[PDB]
Amino acid sequence: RTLIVTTILEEPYVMYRKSDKPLYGNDRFEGYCLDLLKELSNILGFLYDVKLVPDGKYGAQNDKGEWNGMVKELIDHRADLAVAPLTITYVREKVIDFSKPFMTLGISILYRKGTPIDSADDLAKQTKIEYGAVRDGSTMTFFKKSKISTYEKMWAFMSSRQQSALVKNSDEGIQRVLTTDYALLMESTSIEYVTQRNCNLTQIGGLIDSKGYGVGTPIGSPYRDKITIAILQLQEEGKLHMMKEKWWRGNGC
């Protein structure tokens, strides 16, 4: 029995391994999520085949309430597990079964260093500095749904002018921050990774919410609870902490 694991390319979770000759199967990939999969399969004793999600999406609902991405792969039983930086959210948890979190994160702000900006409130009350998030990701959704006045104000701005302040993916966001007067609303784990490698960038303020990434399984999956117990074991042994350090640590600034 070989489990199908849906995932998505995202540094440093899942990356194409560098090679001068064609690579095949699981050997095509490396990263934090490949290391996690190895540790999980060690503990639980399953074989697995990693498969990139065909539409290249994480999982959001459209106008008609239809799902896409890795979430949809789980719902349709085309995958057994999703192992990726898949944010645990209310809307997703209703349609798939998440394991307990293997990594914590919060939404925060990525911006260049040396400015007087110190919080989301600072961005909210002005219009000169543009700010946004990855379109249709869980960060954008948090702002779209929030009733906290500061975050409603930010969503009004982000969604204005045909969402010109939003970006298609994190890399586009990062380049926009580097080049123009732009701040990106980004998950703190990704911010840590980026600021380890771009000495001109920094996190602005603290975390505005509190959540995590979990392994996704279809509703009713017998693996969900086993995966959860494996994750708790890895946490208590210090292994999740070591894995993060391995993939996050940059060359120093």
Ligand X SMILES: O=S1(=O)NCN(C2CC2)c2ccc(F)cc21
Q: Is 94 in the site for a second copy (CB under 8 A)?
A: yes
- Residue 186: φ, ψ to 5°: -150, 150
CA distance 108 to 89: 16
Which parts of 4-23 interact with ligand KAI (CB under 6 A)?
10
Draw the binding track, 81-110, toward Cl ion (x: CB under 5 A; -: no contact): -------------------x----------
Neighbours of 165 (CB within 10 A): 21
Q: Is 83 in the site for ligand KAI (CB under 6 A)?
A: no
Q: Is 85 in the site for ligand KAI (CB under 6 A)?
A: yes
Look at residue 142 and give the partner it binds from ligand X, ligand KAI, a second copy, none, a contact being a CB closer than 5 to 8 Å depending on partner kind: a second copy
Q: Are 218 and 96 in contact (CB under 8 A)?
A: yes
Q: What share of the chain is helix, strand, coil (3-state, %, to 5)?
A: 40, 25, 35
CA distance 184 to 120: 11
- Residue 140: φ, ψ to 5°: -60, -40
Task: State both tokens at 161.
Answer: 């002018």
Draw the binding track, 202-241, toward a second copy (x: CB under 8 A; -: no contact): -------xxx-------------x--xx--xx-xxxx-xx
Minimum CB–partner distance for residue 54 and ligand X (Å): 27
Q: Is 100 in the site for ligand X (CB under 6 A)?
A: yes
Report the residue closest to Cl ion, judged by CB.
100
Binding residues for L-glutamate: 85, 87, 92, 138-139, 187
